[PDB]
Amino acid sequence: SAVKAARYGKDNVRVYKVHKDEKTGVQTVYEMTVCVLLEGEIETSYTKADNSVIVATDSIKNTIYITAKQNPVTPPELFGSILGTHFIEKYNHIHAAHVNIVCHRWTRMDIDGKPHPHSFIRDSEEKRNVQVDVVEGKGIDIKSSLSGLTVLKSTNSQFWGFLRDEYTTLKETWDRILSTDVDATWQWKNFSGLQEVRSHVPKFDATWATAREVTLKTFAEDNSASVQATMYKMAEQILARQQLIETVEYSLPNKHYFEIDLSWHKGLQNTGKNAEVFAPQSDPNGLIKCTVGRS
Amino acid sequence: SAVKAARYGKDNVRVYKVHKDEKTGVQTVYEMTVCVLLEGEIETSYTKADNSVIVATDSIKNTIYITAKQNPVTPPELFGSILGTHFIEKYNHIHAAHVNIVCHRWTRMDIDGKPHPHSFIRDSEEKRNVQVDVVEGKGIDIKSSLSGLTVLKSTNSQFWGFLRDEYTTLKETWDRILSTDVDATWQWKNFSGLQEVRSHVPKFDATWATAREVTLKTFAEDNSASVQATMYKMAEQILARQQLIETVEYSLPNKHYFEIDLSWHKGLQNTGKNAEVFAPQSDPNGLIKCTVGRS
Amino acid sequence: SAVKAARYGKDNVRVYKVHKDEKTGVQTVYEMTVCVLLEGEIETSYTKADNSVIVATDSIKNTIYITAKQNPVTPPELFGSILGTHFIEKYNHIHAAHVNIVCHRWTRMDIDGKPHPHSFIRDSEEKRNVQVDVVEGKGIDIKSSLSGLTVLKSTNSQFWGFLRDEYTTLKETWDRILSTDVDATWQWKNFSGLQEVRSHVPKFDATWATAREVTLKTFAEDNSASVQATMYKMAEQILARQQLIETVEYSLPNKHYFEIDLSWHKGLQNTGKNAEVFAPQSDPNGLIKCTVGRS
Amino acid sequence: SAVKAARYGKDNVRVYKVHKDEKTGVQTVYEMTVCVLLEGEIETSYTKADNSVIVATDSIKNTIYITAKQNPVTPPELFGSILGTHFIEKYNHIHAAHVNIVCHRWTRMDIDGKPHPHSFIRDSEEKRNVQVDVVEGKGIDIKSSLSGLTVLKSTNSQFWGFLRDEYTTLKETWDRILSTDVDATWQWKNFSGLQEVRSHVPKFDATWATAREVTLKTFAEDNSASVQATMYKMAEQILARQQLIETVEYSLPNKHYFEIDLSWHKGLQNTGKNAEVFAPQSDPNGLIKCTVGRS
Ligand SMILES: O=c1[nH]c(=O)c2nc(O)[nH]c2[nH]1
Ligand SMILES: O=c1[nH]c(=O)c2nc(O)[nH]c2[nH]1
Ligand SMILES: O=c1[nH]c(=O)c2nc(O)[nH]c2[nH]1
Ligand SMILES: O=c1[nH]c(=O)c2nc(O)[nH]c2[nH]1
Ligand SMILES: [Cl-]
Ligand SMILES: [Cl-]
Ligand SMILES: [Cl-]
Ligand SMILES: [Cl-]
Ligand code: NA
Ligand code: NA
Ligand code: NA
Ligand code: NA
C-alpha cells in the first residue's frame, strides 16, 4: 500500500486581537477560529515513523498567534494568505497550506445613540469565512463566504408547475412561507502570490458587503417562483458587480412551515387564505445548491 | 411508597403566527417554543394505570395551536397566562399549569433604508422568555427574562483586592477583557387572575426593553470592579423603574480571554500594556449569580 | 434594594485522573466535569465593590485539581462531599458549597476477548451525576442521578382510556413504539458530615447499579399502560432496595414515532398491524415527571 | 452567466423500520437519517423559473419511505444503491443521485443475561455511514465509513524527534495520553450496477466489522510513535483483508490532555512520572488525515 494523500495541522484555534487607536481612544476587536492543514513531503512520518519531517501542530498553533501579532488580521482573505504563504516559504518540504478562517461578529454597541469606544455585542451567529489554498508554484486560491444568515418572508413565495406522478402528494401553492439559512461562497481568480493579494485588499470587504446586500434585497423583493430561481438571481448579480470573481455557489435549506388544519375543532378556519398559525418543521428540509459561473 | 409530586405535558412545541394588516399590507411574524406542564389529581395514572385522569399531551399540543389562533400571542406574558388559565378552568381535576415560552427573534429587514412589509432576519440568538405558573386559588406568577445576550468590552474592567492564600495564583489586574452571555430574570408581583394581567399589558414590553437597555448601558459604561459589582448596579436600576417587579436575578458567565506570552519568540511583547493577541477560553468559566429584591 | 441571594464559582472544570496499579500494570481512568458554587457573607462584593470577601473563581479551579490529586475521585458522591466540605471549613465566611459532578464514561476495551490494561472507549453519552450541597451546621445533602440513557422498545406499549373531549384527536392504541432518554435522581438521607458519608461509601456505586438495572429491566418487561405507570414501578423498586434513599425522581421524554400512511401509493399498507416504516419526530415531545417517596 | 453545477433534494429524512419474525417473536429495529440530492437536466428551473423539470423534494421524501417499505434497509450500502438507482431509472432527465445514510445504533438489550426480543439501547453515538453516488452510464460508487468512535489510551503513546525551530515550544515526550474520535472511510471498487452490488452484499457488514476491529486493536496495541504512524497501520491492514476496497481514509483529531503543574502548592508533584491529574482541552486540537491506496 501507499500514501495517496496526506494533510495534518491544527483545528479550532481561537484568536482574539484588539486594535487601540491612541488618538481617539477607540478600540476595535476581531475574533476568529482558525484551521491550518499542511501538505508536502511528509509521507515517511506515516510509513516509517519518521517525525523529523513533522512541523508539530503545537508549533503551528504558535505560528498563528505570532502571525496575528505581527500582521493585520483583516480582511481575513489577506491574513489567511500571509499565514499560508509563511509555511510554504519557511519549510522547504511543505508544498501546500490550507487555511480556514471563521470570523465571529463583534459589533460596536450604540449607547444613547452614540457608538461606544470599547463595548461590543454578538449581534448574530452569522459568520464571514475564507478558505485559502496556498500551493507552491501555483499561487493562492481564495474562497470567501458568508454563512448562518437566517431569513424568512411570510408571503410572496410560490411553488407550482412541478412534476406530478404517483410519488407526488404535494399541493401546488401560490402563497407560502419561505425561510432559509444562507450559505454563499464566491471563488476569486487565482492570485500569483502575496503581492497580488495585497493589491486587491480593498475589494474583499467591498465584495462581502455586496454579496450580503444582494442576497438580502433579492430575497426580500423577488416574487419567488422557487428557491432555485431566486438563488440564481442572487448569483447573477454578484458576478456582474465583481469581475475578479469566477464562480458563486449558494446552498440553501428550505425550512418548511406547515399549515395546521384546525377545522376538526368547531370548524375553525386556519388553512389557505385563513392561515395564521403554522407549525415550523425541524426536519426534514429541502436542500438546494447551485454553482454559477461566466459564459 | 407514595407520589409526592407529579407533572406532565408537552415540551418543544414550535409555533409560528402571522398578523396581516389589511390596510397597509404590512405583515408581522411571531415564533416561539412552548412547554406546558400540568399538575392536579392525577396520581392514579401513575399508581393504578388509570388514564381517565390524563389530558393527553397530544391534546395539550392541539390546545396550544387553537389558543394561539384565537388570542394574541404578544406579549408572551399575556399569552402564557391565557394558556395556563385555560387548563385549570377547563379541567376540574387540574389545579396548576406551568407554561414556558421562548420567543425567537424575527426582525423586520431594512431594504434600501426602508422597512420591508414581509421579510425578516434572525438578527440574534438572543431570546425573550416567560415562565407562567397558574395555580388554582393562588393566582398567576410570572417570571420574565432575556437570555443569550452576548457582550464583550475590551477595557474598563478590573479585578484586584481579592482574597489571596495558598490556593491562589491569579494576578491582580487593573485592565482586562470582560465578556459574558447575559441571563436576566424579573419576577412580577403575584396577579390575582387574567383580568389583572390584562390591566398591566403595556408594562410587559416596556419593562423588557428597560431591562435590556439598562443591562447594555451599565455594562458599557461601568468601570467594572468585578462581575458581582456590575450586575448589582443593573438589578438596582431595573427595580427602581418598575415597582411591579419584586426581584431581579442575574446569572453571568465570566468568559475568559487569556493573555499570550510570546516573549520566548524573539522577545516579542504581548502582555500587559503590550497585549494585542489573546486566547479565548471555551472552558472553564466563572459563574456569578445574584438575586436582588426590595428592602 | 437588597441582596436576597448570592452564589458564585467555577463551572465546566474538566478533570481527568489516572490510577496506576504498580503490580498488575493495570491503569484506570476517570473523567468528569465539575462545578462549584459558594455562598456566604459575600454581599459586599456586590454592593460595595469589596473583593476582600471573594475567593477568586480561579482559586476555586485550582482547589478542584489539588483536591483530586490528594483524594479519591470515586465514588463521585464522596469526592463531591470532600470538595464541598473543604470550602466551608477553610473559609470562615463561606457557609455553603454546591458541587455538581458529571462523570463521563471511559469503558475498558476488550481486545481479543481480554480486558486491555490501558485502553478505553466512550461506550455511551450516558452520564452519572451528583449534586452535593454542603451547608455549615446542616450537614451534607446528596442527589445522585443517571442521565442520557436512551432506550426504545418496538412493542408492548399501550395508551388507551385517556380523557377525550373537543381538544382530542389522538387515537387510542394497544400497540406502539415507546422511546425515551432516561433521567433518574435518587436523593439520600441527609448526612451529618464527611465521616458519615465515608461510612456508606460502598452503597453509592451499588445503588447506582441497582437504579440502572431496575430502570432497564422494568422498561423492557413492563407491558406499559403509560409512561406514568411504567416510571412509577421503577421508582417503587429502587426505594424498596435502598432504605437510605428518601425520594426518587424520574423525568422522561416521550419521543414519538409516527406511523406513515402510504395507502395513497398503490394501496400500500403501512398502518396498524401492517406498520413497518415510521417517521421519528424530533419535536414536539411528551414530558412526564414524578417524584416518589415513602408513605 | 451560466449554471456550472446544480443539485437539490431532501436532507435530514429520519426513517425507522421494524422487522418482525413471526416465528420467534423477535423484533429488530433500524433507524437512519437519509439525504438524497439529484442532478440532471434541471438548469431551466434556475434560469427560466421552469418547475416542470423539478421532482419536488417532498416527493423525494415520499420515495424514501416507500422504498424502505418495499426493500431491505440493511446493509445500508444496498439500500442506498436501490434508492439512487430508482431516481435515474424512473426520471429520464435525472442523470445522477447522491444518497447519504447515517445509521443510528439500536442495540438489543441483555436482560438477566438473555437477549430481549423487542427492547433496545442507544449504546453509543457512534455511527455507520454510506455515501452512494449513482451516475447514469458510470455505475455505482460507494464510500462506507464509521464515525464518532471515541477512544483513549492512558499510556503507550509517544511523540519525539519532530522538527524544532524558533516556533517550537513543545517538549518531546515518551509517555502521553492519546485520545481521538475516529473517522474512517473505505471506498469500494466501482460497481457496474445494482446486480453487482447485490452479488457482494455479504461483504459490506463483514468489512465494516473488520474496519472497526482493526481500528480498535491497532489503537490499543500499537506503541504509538505518532498519530500519523498509528493510523497508517490501521489503513494498511484493512486494505490487506478486503481486495474490493481501493482506498482507506482516516481523519483523526488529537484531543489533548495537558499536565497540571501543582508544585507551586506545597511542592505537590504532578508532572512527568508523577502525573495523575490532567486538564482535558476542548480546543484547539490536532487534526491528522491520510488516504492510503494500493501500490
Ligand atoms: O423552492 C422549492 N424548490 C423545490 O425543489 C421544492 N420541492 C418541494 O417539495 N418544495 C420546493 N420548493
Ligand atoms: O469579576 C470577577 N469575579 C470573580 O469572582 C472572579 N474570580 C476570578 O478568578 N476572576 C473573577 N472576576
Ligand atoms: O404514556 C403516555 N402518557 C401520556 O400522558 C400521553 N399523552 C399522549 O398524547 N400520549 C401519551 N403517552
Ligand atoms: O501524533 C502527533 N502528531 C503530530 O503531528 C503532532 N504535533 C503535535 O504538536 N503533537 C503531535 N502528535
Ligand atoms: Cl424544498
Ligand atoms: Cl470569574
Ligand atoms: Cl406523551
Ligand atoms: Cl496533534
Ligand atoms: Na516548500
Ligand atoms: Na381545576
Ligand atoms: Na464557614
Ligand atoms: Na435518467
Side-chain angles (χ1 to χ4, degrees), chain A residues 1-3 5-21 24-91 93-113 115-137 139-142 144-170 172-212 214-272 274-295, chain B residues 1-3 5-21 24-91 93-113 115-137 139-142 144-170 172-212 214-272 274-295, chain C residues 1-3 5-21 24-91 93-113 115-137 139-142 144-170 172-212 214-272 274-295, chain D residues 1-3 5-21 24-91 93-113 115-137 139-142 144-170 172-212 214-272 274-295:
Chain A
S1 62
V3 173
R7 63 177 64 185
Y8 81 101
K10 207 68 144 188
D11 193 14
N12 292 305
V13 178
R14 302 186 64 192
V15 185
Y16 162 105
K17 188 180 188 187
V18 58
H19 169 269
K20 296 171 166 164
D21 190 322
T24 59
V26 171
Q27 311 198 351
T28 306
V29 299
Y30 303 94
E31 187 172 327
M32 68 204 73
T33 299
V34 181
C35 174
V36 176
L37 297 180
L38 309 177
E39 304 191 60
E41 301 171 34
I42 57 170
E43 313 84 19
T44 63
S45 69
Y46 298 86
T47 60
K48 304 294 195 189
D50 180 25
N51 291 341
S52 67
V53 300
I54 298 293
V55 171
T57 65
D58 187 89
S59 305
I60 293 172
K61 174 189 71 172
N62 291 337
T63 298
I64 292 167
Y65 293 141
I66 288 167
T67 303
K69 174 66 182 196
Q70 301 183 299
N71 300 277
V73 296
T74 184
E77 282 94 342
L78 173 63
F79 177 64
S81 298
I82 291 168
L83 187 51
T85 297
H86 162 88
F87 288 103
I88 62 153
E89 286 191 350
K90 170 76 186 168
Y91 302 102
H93 64 298
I94 294 306
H95 306 306
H98 308 283
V99 179
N100 189 258
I101 301 177
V102 175
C103 300
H104 307 281
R105 286 173 75 89
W106 283 121
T107 312
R108 194 173 302 283
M109 279 188 203
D110 283 323
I111 302 296
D112 288 333
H116 199 276
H118 56 248
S119 302
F120 308 85
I121 185 169
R122 161 86 25 98
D123 73 304
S124 171
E125 278 306 309
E126 173 192 323
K127 305 309 180 184
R128 171 178 173 180
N129 321 282
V130 299
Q131 173 70 28
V132 179
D133 308 333
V134 179
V135 184
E136 189 164 22
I140 303 185
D141 291 311
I142 306 186
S144 312
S145 62
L146 60 79
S147 62
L149 169 55
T150 292
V151 294
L152 176 156
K153 66 193 302 182
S154 42
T155 189
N156 272 25
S157 164
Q158 305 175 28
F159 193 61
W160 55 266
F162 49 87
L163 189 155
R164 311 195 63 88
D165 62 2
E166 70 267 15
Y167 294 92
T168 305
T169 53
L170 182 67
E172 298 181 317
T173 189
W174 284 260
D175 191 7
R176 66 172 188 179
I177 293 155
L178 178 58
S179 185
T180 187
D181 308 337
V182 179
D183 199 321
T185 302
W186 48 103
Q187 158 77 267
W188 296 87
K189 175 193 86 80
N190 173 262
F191 300 113
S192 59
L194 250 186
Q195 183 190 347
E196 190 176 0
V197 169
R198 281 188 199 279
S199 78
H200 292 294
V201 153
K203 305 201 174 65
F204 297 123
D205 287 354
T207 300
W208 165 83
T210 296
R212 192 176 187 271
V214 162
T215 293
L216 289 175
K217 178 163 155 80
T218 304
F219 179 82
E221 288 178 350
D222 192 40
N223 205 149
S224 179
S226 73
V227 174
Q228 284 90 343
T230 301
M231 72 198 291
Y232 181 82
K233 290 183 194 194
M234 297 174 177
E236 197 171 40
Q237 274 171 99
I238 296 171
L239 283 173
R241 286 146 89 148
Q242 189 44 276
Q243 294 302 291
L244 256 13
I245 300 306
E246 298 236 272
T247 66
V248 178
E249 177 174 26
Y250 273 90
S251 177
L252 299 186
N254 190 0
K255 304 166 92 194
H256 308 295
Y257 283 67
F258 286 178
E259 287 186 352
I260 303 173
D261 186 353
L262 295 177
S263 62
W264 57 268
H265 185 80
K266 299 178 178 160
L268 207 46
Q269 294 302 302
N270 193 47
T271 65
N274 301 122
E276 292 181 277
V277 180
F278 290 73
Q281 305 296 301
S282 294
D283 61 73
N285 62 276
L287 181 56
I288 323 303
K289 296 181 186 273
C290 184
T291 302
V292 179
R294 301 177 187 284
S295 66
Chain B
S1 62
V3 173
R7 63 177 64 185
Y8 81 101
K10 207 68 144 188
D11 193 14
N12 292 305
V13 178
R14 302 186 64 192
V15 185
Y16 162 105
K17 188 180 188 187
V18 58
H19 169 269
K20 296 171 166 164
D21 190 322
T24 59
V26 171
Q27 311 198 351
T28 306
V29 299
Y30 303 94
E31 187 172 327
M32 68 204 73
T33 299
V34 181
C35 174
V36 176
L37 297 180
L38 309 177
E39 304 191 60
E41 301 171 34
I42 57 170
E43 313 84 19
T44 63
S45 69
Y46 298 86
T47 60
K48 304 294 195 189
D50 180 25
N51 291 341
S52 67
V53 300
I54 298 293
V55 171
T57 65
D58 187 89
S59 305
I60 293 172
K61 174 189 71 172
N62 291 337
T63 298
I64 292 167
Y65 293 141
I66 288 167
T67 303
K69 174 66 182 196
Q70 301 183 299
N71 300 277
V73 296
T74 184
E77 282 94 342
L78 173 63
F79 177 64
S81 298
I82 291 168
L83 187 51
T85 297
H86 162 88
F87 288 103
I88 62 153
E89 286 191 350
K90 170 76 186 168
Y91 302 102
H93 64 298
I94 294 306
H95 306 306
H98 308 283
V99 179
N100 189 258
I101 301 177
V102 175
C103 300
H104 307 281
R105 286 173 75 89
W106 283 121
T107 312
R108 194 173 302 283
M109 279 188 203
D110 283 323
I111 302 296
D112 288 333
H116 199 276
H118 56 248
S119 302
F120 308 85
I121 185 169
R122 161 86 25 98
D123 73 304
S124 171
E125 278 306 309
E126 173 192 323
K127 305 309 180 184
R128 171 178 173 180
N129 321 282
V130 299
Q131 173 70 28
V132 179
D133 308 333
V134 179
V135 184
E136 189 164 22
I140 303 185
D141 291 311
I142 306 186
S144 312
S145 62
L146 60 79
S147 62
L149 169 55
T150 292
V151 294
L152 176 156
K153 66 193 302 182
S154 42
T155 189
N156 272 25
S157 164
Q158 305 175 28
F159 193 61
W160 55 266
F162 49 87
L163 189 155
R164 311 195 63 88
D165 62 2
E166 70 267 15
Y167 294 92
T168 305
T169 53
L170 182 67
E172 298 181 317
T173 189
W174 284 260
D175 191 7
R176 66 172 188 179
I177 293 155
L178 178 58
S179 185
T180 187
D181 308 337
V182 179
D183 199 321
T185 302
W186 48 103
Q187 158 77 267
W188 296 87
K189 175 193 86 80
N190 173 262
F191 300 113
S192 59
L194 250 186
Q195 183 190 347
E196 190 176 0
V197 169
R198 281 188 199 279
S199 78
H200 292 294
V201 153
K203 305 201 174 65
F204 297 123
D205 287 354
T207 300
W208 165 83
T210 296
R212 192 176 187 271
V214 162
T215 293
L216 289 175
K217 178 163 155 80
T218 304
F219 179 82
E221 288 178 350
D222 192 40
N223 205 149
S224 179
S226 73
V227 174
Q228 284 90 343
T230 301
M231 72 198 291
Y232 181 82
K233 290 183 194 194
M234 297 174 177
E236 197 171 40
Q237 274 171 99
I238 296 171
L239 283 173
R241 286 146 89 148
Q242 189 44 276
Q243 294 302 291
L244 256 13
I245 300 306
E246 298 236 272
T247 66
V248 178
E249 177 174 26
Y250 273 90
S251 177
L252 299 186
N254 190 0
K255 304 166 92 194
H256 308 295
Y257 283 67
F258 286 178
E259 287 186 352
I260 303 173
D261 186 353
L262 295 177
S263 62
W264 57 268
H265 185 80
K266 299 178 178 160
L268 207 46
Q269 294 302 302
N270 193 47
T271 65
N274 301 122
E276 292 181 277
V277 180
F278 290 73
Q281 305 296 301
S282 294
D283 61 73
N285 62 276
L287 181 56
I288 323 303
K289 296 181 186 273
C290 184
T291 302
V292 179
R294 301 177 187 284
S295 66
Chain C
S1 62
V3 173
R7 63 177 64 185
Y8 81 101
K10 207 68 144 188
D11 193 14
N12 292 305
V13 178
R14 302 186 64 192
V15 185
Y16 162 105
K17 188 180 188 187
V18 58
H19 169 269
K20 296 171 166 164
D21 190 322
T24 59
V26 171
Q27 311 198 351
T28 306
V29 299
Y30 303 94
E31 187 172 327
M32 68 204 73
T33 299
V34 181
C35 174
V36 176
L37 297 180
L38 309 177
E39 304 191 60
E41 301 171 34
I42 57 170
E43 313 84 19
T44 63
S45 69
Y46 298 86
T47 60
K48 304 294 195 189
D50 180 25
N51 291 341
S52 67
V53 300
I54 298 293
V55 171
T57 65
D58 187 89
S59 305
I60 293 172
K61 174 189 71 172
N62 291 337
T63 298
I64 292 167
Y65 293 141
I66 288 167
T67 303
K69 174 66 182 196
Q70 301 183 299
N71 300 277
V73 296
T74 184
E77 282 94 342
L78 173 63
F79 177 64
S81 298
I82 291 168
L83 187 51
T85 297
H86 162 88
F87 288 103
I88 62 153
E89 286 191 350
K90 170 76 186 168
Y91 302 102
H93 64 298
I94 294 306
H95 306 306
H98 308 283
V99 179
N100 189 258
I101 301 177
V102 175
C103 300
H104 307 281
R105 286 173 75 89
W106 283 121
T107 312
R108 194 173 302 283
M109 279 188 203
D110 283 323
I111 302 296
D112 288 333
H116 199 276
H118 56 248
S119 302
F120 308 85
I121 185 169
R122 161 86 25 98
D123 73 304
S124 171
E125 278 306 309
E126 173 192 323
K127 305 309 180 184
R128 171 178 173 180
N129 321 282
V130 299
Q131 173 70 28
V132 179
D133 308 333
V134 179
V135 184
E136 189 164 22
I140 303 185
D141 291 311
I142 306 186
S144 312
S145 62
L146 60 79
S147 62
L149 169 55
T150 292
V151 294
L152 176 156
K153 66 193 302 182
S154 42
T155 189
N156 272 25
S157 164
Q158 305 175 28
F159 193 61
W160 55 266
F162 49 87
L163 189 155
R164 311 195 63 88
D165 62 2
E166 70 267 15
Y167 294 92
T168 305
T169 53
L170 182 67
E172 298 181 317
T173 189
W174 284 260
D175 191 7
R176 66 172 188 179
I177 293 155
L178 178 58
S179 185
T180 187
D181 308 337
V182 179
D183 199 321
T185 302
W186 48 103
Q187 158 77 267
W188 296 87
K189 175 193 86 80
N190 173 262
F191 300 113
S192 59
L194 250 186
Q195 183 190 347
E196 190 176 0
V197 169
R198 281 188 199 279
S199 78
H200 292 294
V201 153
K203 305 201 174 65
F204 297 123
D205 287 354
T207 300
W208 165 83
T210 296
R212 192 176 187 271
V214 162
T215 293
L216 289 175
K217 178 163 155 80
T218 304
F219 179 82
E221 288 178 350
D222 192 40
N223 205 149
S224 179
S226 73
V227 174
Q228 284 90 343
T230 301
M231 72 198 291
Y232 181 82
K233 290 183 194 194
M234 297 174 177
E236 197 171 40
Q237 274 171 99
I238 296 171
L239 283 173
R241 286 146 89 148
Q242 189 44 276
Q243 294 302 291
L244 256 13
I245 300 306
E246 298 236 272
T247 66
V248 178
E249 177 174 26
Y250 273 90
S251 177
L252 299 186
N254 190 0
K255 304 166 92 194
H256 308 295
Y257 283 67
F258 286 178
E259 287 186 352
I260 303 173
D261 186 353
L262 295 177
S263 62
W264 57 268
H265 185 80
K266 299 178 178 160
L268 207 46
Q269 294 302 302
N270 193 47
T271 65
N274 301 122
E276 292 181 277
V277 180
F278 290 73
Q281 305 296 301
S282 294
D283 61 73
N285 62 276
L287 181 56
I288 323 303
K289 296 181 186 273
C290 184
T291 302
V292 179
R294 301 177 187 284
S295 66
Chain D
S1 62
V3 173
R7 63 177 64 185
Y8 81 101
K10 207 68 144 188
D11 193 14
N12 292 305
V13 178
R14 302 186 64 192
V15 185
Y16 162 105
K17 188 180 188 187
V18 58
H19 169 269
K20 296 171 166 164
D21 190 322
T24 59
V26 171
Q27 311 198 351
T28 306
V29 299
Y30 303 94
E31 187 172 327
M32 68 204 73
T33 299
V34 181
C35 174
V36 176
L37 297 180
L38 309 177
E39 304 191 60
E41 301 171 34
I42 57 170
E43 313 84 19
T44 63
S45 69
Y46 298 86
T47 60
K48 304 294 195 189
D50 180 25
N51 291 341
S52 67
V53 300
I54 298 293
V55 171
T57 65
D58 187 89
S59 305
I60 293 172
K61 174 189 71 172
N62 291 337
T63 298
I64 292 167
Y65 293 141
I66 288 167
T67 303
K69 174 66 182 196
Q70 301 183 299
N71 300 277
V73 296
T74 184
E77 282 94 342
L78 173 63
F79 177 64
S81 298
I82 291 168
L83 187 51
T85 297
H86 162 88
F87 288 103
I88 62 153
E89 286 191 350
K90 170 76 186 168
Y91 302 102
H93 64 298
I94 294 306
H95 306 306
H98 308 283
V99 179
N100 189 258
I101 301 177
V102 175
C103 300
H104 307 281
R105 286 173 75 89
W106 283 121
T107 312
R108 194 173 302 283
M109 279 188 203
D110 283 323
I111 302 296
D112 288 333
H116 199 276
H118 56 248
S119 302
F120 308 85
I121 185 169
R122 161 86 25 98
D123 73 304
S124 171
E125 278 306 309
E126 173 192 323
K127 305 309 180 184
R128 171 178 173 180
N129 321 282
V130 299
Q131 173 70 28
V132 179
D133 308 333
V134 179
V135 184
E136 189 164 22
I140 303 185
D141 291 311
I142 306 186
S144 312
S145 62
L146 60 79
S147 62
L149 169 55
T150 292
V151 294
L152 176 156
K153 66 193 302 182
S154 42
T155 189
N156 272 25
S157 164
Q158 305 175 28
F159 193 61
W160 55 266
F162 49 87
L163 189 155
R164 311 195 63 88
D165 62 2
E166 70 267 15
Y167 294 92
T168 305
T169 53
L170 182 67
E172 298 181 317
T173 189
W174 284 260
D175 191 7
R176 66 172 188 179
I177 293 155
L178 178 58
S179 185
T180 187
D181 308 337
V182 179
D183 199 321
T185 302
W186 48 103
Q187 158 77 267
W188 296 87
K189 175 193 86 80
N190 173 262
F191 300 113
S192 59
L194 250 186
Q195 183 190 347
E196 190 176 0
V197 169
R198 281 188 199 279
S199 78
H200 292 294
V201 153
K203 305 201 174 65
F204 297 123
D205 287 354
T207 300
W208 165 83
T210 296
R212 192 176 187 271
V214 162
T215 293
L216 289 175
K217 178 163 155 80
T218 304
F219 179 82
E221 288 178 350
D222 192 40
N223 205 149
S224 179
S226 73
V227 174
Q228 284 90 343
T230 301
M231 72 198 291
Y232 181 82
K233 290 183 194 194
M234 297 174 177
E236 197 171 40
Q237 274 171 99
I238 296 171
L239 283 173
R241 286 146 89 148
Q242 189 44 276
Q243 294 302 291
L244 256 13
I245 300 306
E246 298 236 272
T247 66
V248 178
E249 177 174 26
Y250 273 90
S251 177
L252 299 186
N254 190 0
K255 304 166 92 194
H256 308 295
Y257 283 67
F258 286 178
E259 287 186 352
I260 303 173
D261 186 353
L262 295 177
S263 62
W264 57 268
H265 185 80
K266 299 178 178 160
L268 207 46
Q269 294 302 302
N270 193 47
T271 65
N274 301 122
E276 292 181 277
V277 180
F278 290 73
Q281 305 296 301
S282 294
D283 61 73
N285 62 276
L287 181 56
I288 323 303
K289 296 181 186 273
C290 184
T291 302
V292 179
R294 301 177 187 284
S295 66

